[PDB]
Amino acid sequence: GLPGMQNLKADPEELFTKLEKIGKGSFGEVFKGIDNRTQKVVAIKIIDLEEAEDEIEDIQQEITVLSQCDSPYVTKYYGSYLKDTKLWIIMEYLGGGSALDLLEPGPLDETQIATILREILKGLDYLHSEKKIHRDIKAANVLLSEHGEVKLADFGVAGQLTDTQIKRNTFVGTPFWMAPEVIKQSAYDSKADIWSLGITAIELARGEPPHSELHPMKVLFLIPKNNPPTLEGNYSKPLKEFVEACLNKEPSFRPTAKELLKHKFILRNAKKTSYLTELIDRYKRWKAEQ
Ligand SMILES: COCCOc1ccc2c(c1)ncn2-c1ccc2cccc(N3CCC(N)CC3)c2n1
């Protein structure tokens, strides 16, 4: 049973105006769309079920995880529709762009970095409290509203802890951002997300994660074997220490999301999310390029 499945008489090509492609996630392409009843903009993931071979269960799991989340920091799921062989999956649209998009005009300042990290941490705190693990935290999966609100996206590989399975062992994620214990397929939990957050912090500061120049298969040994990455360059000591705190090889040595919300880098530098509109405006004016 697929949570939020609508009446199969409903025609999504009638109910929604499909616009441009805006992304490609772990499973399926995502489009901008208009809800023709409300005129609100939505994000629509479209899946050809006739093609999908092993990914239908994955697609279903993603929708299930989203449907179980109710947070200002997690993309909303509205429902799903069928048009012949294609599944239209209707979700929240955030018009500011991903944090990675917003990096294209130039570097972030540490106030922007701290603000974005703080909001990511609020989302992680929510998820981890629900015993969920995102497992694909990276700047491309951090979306901003046109007002500067920051939300987590793409739950395509998200994990669920239960009283039966206290830990996971699945090899999932995006290689450069994956925790060493995930790569080794040791037993892991929400601390894996804290490692990915540290990598994302480096990404927000420098524009790319560590090892970005290498073939992803090399991280299969590099991340488990090497000392953890550090933030190199002219950045504040609290930011460098924030990164170090996240990027410890031992998961029990990483702070919780809740704890990092009080980290000196966050408290000293983060400001109102509304200020992030400057970053969104910067990107709009920048992509006014021929
Ligand atoms: C240039 O920026 C234009 C806005 O770009 C986007 C891109 C994706 C968006 C979005 C806005 N508003 C909501 N989403 C969603 C909504 C539901 C999603 C489900 C699975 C995967 C997604 N994305 C996340 C961003 C990533 N970069 C690619 C895959 C999803 N993205």
Q: Three-class SS string for 98-164?
A: ECCHHHCCCCCCHHHHHHHHHHHHHHHHHHHHCCEECCCCCHHHEEECCCCCEEECCCCCCEECCCC
Two tokens, residue 143: 């979306």
φ and ψ of 166, to 5 deg? -70, -20
CA distance 104 to 207: 8
Give the distance, in angstroms, between the CA of residue 71 and the centroid of all CA atoms in the same chain. Answer: 14
Q: What is the resolution of this structure in A?
A: 1.8
**CA 75–ligand 1 middle distance (angstroms):** 9
Task: Work out the widest C-alpha separation in the chain, in whole angstroms.
Answer: 59
Give bridge partners of residue 142 from the DSSP assignment: 152
Two tokens, residue 125: 């705190």
> Is 155 labeled as ligand-binding?
no
φ and ψ of 288, to 5 deg? -75, 65
End-to-end CA distance of the chain: 48
> Is 248 labeled as ligand-binding?
no
Q: Angle at the Cα of 180 (from 174 to 184), degrees rounded to 5?
A: 95
Q: Angle at the Cα of 105 (from 103 to 108), degrees rounded to 5?
A: 45
CA distance 59 to 73: 21
CATH class assigned to 1-93: alpha beta
Using CB distances shorter than 6 Å, the residues near ligand 1 are: 22-25, 30, 43, 45, 75, 91-94, 97-98, 101, 140-141, 143, 153-154
> Is 1 labeled as ligand-binding?
no
Query: Identity (one letter) of the amino acid at 277?
Result: T
Mutate which of 19, 22, 27, 88 for ligand 1? The one with the most ligand atoms within 8 Å of its CB, which is 22
CA distance 160 to 171: 14
CATH 1.10.510.10 residue ranges for the chain: 94-290
CATH class assigned to 94-290: mainly alpha
Strand 142-144, strand 41-48: pairing: unpaired
CA distance 7 to 16: 15
**CA 172–ligand 1 middle distance (angstroms):** 19
- 111 within 8 A of 266, measured Cβ to Cβ: no
- 158 within 8 A of 65, measured Cβ to Cβ: yes
CA distance 15 to 11: 6
- Residue that is written with structure tokens 């990511």 in the block: 120
175: left (phi over 0), alpha (psi -120 to 50) or beta: alpha
Give bridge partners of residue 33 from the DSSP assignment: 18, 42
* Atom number in ligand 1 closest to CA 26: 21
CA distance 83 to 97: 28
Beta strands in 11-84 (DSSP E): 16-24, 29-35, 41-48, 77-83
CA distance 57 to 64: 10
Collect contacts of 238-243 with beta carbons under 8 A, ≥24 apart: 238/263, 238/264, 238/265, 238/268, 238/269, 239/110, 239/113, 239/114, 239/201, 239/205, 239/265, 239/269, 241/265, 242/117, 242/198, 242/201, 242/266, 243/198, 243/201, 243/202, 243/205
CA nearest to 257, candidates 139, 117, 124: 124
**CA 282–ligand 1 middle distance (angstroms):** 19
Residues classed as catalytic:
136
Mutate which of 29, 35, 136, 143 for ligand 1? The one with the most ligand atoms within 8 Å of its CB, which is 143
Give bridge partners of residue 133 from the DSSP assignment: 159
Nearest CA residue ID for atom 15, ligand 1: 43
Nearest CA residue ID for atom 2, ligand 1: 97
Two tokens, residue 228: 């953890």
CATH 3.30.200.20 residue ranges for the chain: 1-93
Nearest CA residue ID for atom 20, ligand 1: 154
Query: Which residues fall within 8 angstroms of residue 284, CB to CB, at 6 or more apart?
Result: none
- Residue that is written with structure tokens 């006014």 in the block: 288
- Dihedral, CA atoms, 101, 136, 191, 103, nearest 10 degrees? -10
> Is 289 labeled as ligand-binding?
no
> Is 84 labeled as ligand-binding?
no
CA distance 128 to 47: 29
Side-chain half-sphere CA neighbours of 118 within 13 A:
22
- 34 within 8 A of 16, measured Cβ to Cβ: yes
- Dihedral, CA atoms, 155, 157, 159, 165, nearest 10 degrees? 160
